[PDB]
Design a binder for this molecule. Sequence first.
Ligand SMILES: [Cl-]
Ligand SMILES: [Cl-]
Ligand SMILES: [Cl-]
Ligand SMILES: [Cl-]
Ligand SMILES: [Cl-]
Ligand SMILES: [K+]
Ligand SMILES: [K+]
Ligand SMILES: [K+]
Ligand code: NA
Lengths: 164, 163, 164, 165, 162
Amino acid sequence: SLINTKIKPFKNQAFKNGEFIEVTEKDTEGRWSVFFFYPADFTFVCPTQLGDVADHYEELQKLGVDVYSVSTDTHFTHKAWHSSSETIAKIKYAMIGDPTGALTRNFDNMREDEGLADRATFVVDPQGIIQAIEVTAEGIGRDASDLLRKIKAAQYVAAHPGEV
Amino acid sequence: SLINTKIKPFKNQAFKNGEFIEVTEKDTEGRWSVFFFYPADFTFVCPTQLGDVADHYEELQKLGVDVYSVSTDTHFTHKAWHSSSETIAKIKYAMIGDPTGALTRNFDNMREDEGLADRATFVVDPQGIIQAIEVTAEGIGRDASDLLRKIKAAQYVAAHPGE
Amino acid sequence: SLINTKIKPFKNQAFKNGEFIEVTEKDTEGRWSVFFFYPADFTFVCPTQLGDVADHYEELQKLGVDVYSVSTDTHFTHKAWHSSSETIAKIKYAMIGDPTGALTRNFDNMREDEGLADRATFVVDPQGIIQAIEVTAEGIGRDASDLLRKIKAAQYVAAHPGEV
Amino acid sequence: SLINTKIKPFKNQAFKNGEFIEVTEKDTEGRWSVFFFYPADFTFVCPTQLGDVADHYEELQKLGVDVYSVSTDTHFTHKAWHSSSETIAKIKYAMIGDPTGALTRNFDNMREDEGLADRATFVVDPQGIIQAIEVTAEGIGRDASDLLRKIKAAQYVAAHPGEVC
Amino acid sequence: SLINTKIKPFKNQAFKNGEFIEVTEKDTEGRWSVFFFYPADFTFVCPTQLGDVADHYEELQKLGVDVYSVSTDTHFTHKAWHSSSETIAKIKYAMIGDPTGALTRNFDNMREDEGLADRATFVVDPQGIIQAIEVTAEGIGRDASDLLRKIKAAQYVAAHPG
Ligand SMILES: [Cl-]
Ligand SMILES: [Cl-]
Ligand SMILES: [Cl-]
Ligand SMILES: [Cl-]
Ligand SMILES: [Cl-]
Ligand SMILES: [K+]
Ligand SMILES: [K+]
Ligand SMILES: [K+]
Ligand code: NA
């Protein structure tokens, strides 16, 4: 896996709370980040995983954690999904579009025969180092509460080296 | 250009008139086909170009011509766009999703730095041979009635070799 | 296709209005240009296509658009054709000869088995960028009216970034 | 990642309930499997993690799930750790030795500059397909109850595909 | 040079006395052939050399010699040049069009940076063997009577070894 490696440079458009923005690796420097990949917009399972992160987003932000969801759809499509779905409408974090697949390939997370990212979550520290990875097949679900736990533990170890 | 070359094999998912189907090169064999590429769903310009073609679709179907629109979006996204845009809702031809880019690259039509297809139309005859190509940059616009003229001309020449 | 790519340097002889001239990419810099390729002089279909563009040439010039017709014949052959055909005699734009096939290959438009150019039209903006392309098989025909519409729309969006 | 790929063949010695045994991919066929990698025996953090899985092992076995822990130590070393640590002593699942690192590298899970496996857990279905992956850095810890939840969810979607809530 | 080598196969359209024909290597087999290359139709200098050859054409025909002029112009252009120029109009042999340059390149006679053949004449015997080569720069002429000299000689040595 990519554990304990540094994230690679990237530049992507995103939809975030009603506007289009550009995100690059420079935006992650000095911050905690979650990169939350999923296969496709306008599908039936993904929203509740994304929705579960949205439910925890206020707490994450208090911990100084930025959240970026990523699929190979465009930011135009994310904006439409956000208007049309009430689960997605509660997302206030950045929804990155990755239609070249470059961000997804940076995280070695592309299904090449489908052109879609796998269901993978990466926790990245202020120095750009991947501290946790979770990947699941369809239907197995990613629990945002267990994600919060890992982030708090990763922040703890960073602040107090030499104990778990 | 790809003019007078044979189209390449492909297999894609599509949204067509309320259902999801698979489209391959074998469905084009023995028919006239239009492959109408565009950059992205849920943008502002593309729909009236696609809608133009939809207006002419009954006539095209009378001439034995199938229409396939293509972008690197998914068929899921095409279905959503079709339910949200009054213009896209008119479309009764297949909307192919090409998220791997393979179909777009077959037609040498990928903007690689963007992962989107360029605005290109290809007219393909029942033997798979590309008989007309049109490509435009943003803002310039494709005229569906010029497309029909070219299709009719292509069919005439097919039916009156040497003239 | 070559859409949104920059034209390549070239140097060719041309017949224009009784004179032999040299055309290079420098003549296209800062101008709109139409490169109108065709297979062969002294054939029977091509004159109509070329004559139709000639009919629009006054207006194209008014709009700051130069026209170059191109085949793999020589500029000598173009001069003769201009004397013999009254449709070709209408032509006041440059008729480029491309016997090395180099200009035709710059535009990826050679039928290599015949040594003749395919029936292709390229619109090139003042920065040398290809903004529109049309290629047709024998007998289908290019409509100069649609060409004129396309040039006007390309000029419009150059002048009004974002809009139509 | 390796998600949705088939596990590669392997053959390794292991210590399990007072015996040395051989384990290969054939032993995993037709069963749910958990491959629990950790860096090194006779260290201080690892055993609480192995112990947590040990606590949940009876429940895992009633779900038809086999557990294999893996480090690049030998099976001899596992046997000795099992005699010396009261925490490791409660392990009843197989402790696989991977001194060549081949089982670790099959799962793309080697820290090459240390020759130790990273802290990764893989859930493998009865067809050999990897259905869940978790990897953590030191100190972050792996929650065996969250593992059990994922295993039940994977069993559920296997039994009832395309079902949607 | 290509002397004493066998010509390569080719397939070209030509204009010959009011009509269009295909010429291939097969049409030279069993016959003597002259391939007369020139740079371009509808220029000033070339017609006299082609004319010079035209004058001697019935004589050649009675020696068993087929004539083929070649430029990288098309046969459409050759037809047109025929109507336009009195000189060219008196040609009765085949004017081959070589727009792909392949026939020219078979005889290694392409000026690559112009896409035009050089001024070269090749004599080919019934077995396809090149027996005489002449190449001249612009302005220096190619005199047809010297070509008849060379051909008659070439035929002598063929029927009378040594
Ligand atoms: Cl990974
Ligand atoms: Cl093309
Ligand atoms: Cl092109
Ligand atoms: Cl992995
Ligand atoms: Cl030679
Ligand atoms: K895409
Ligand atoms: K030529
Ligand atoms: K070791
Ligand atoms: Na994959």
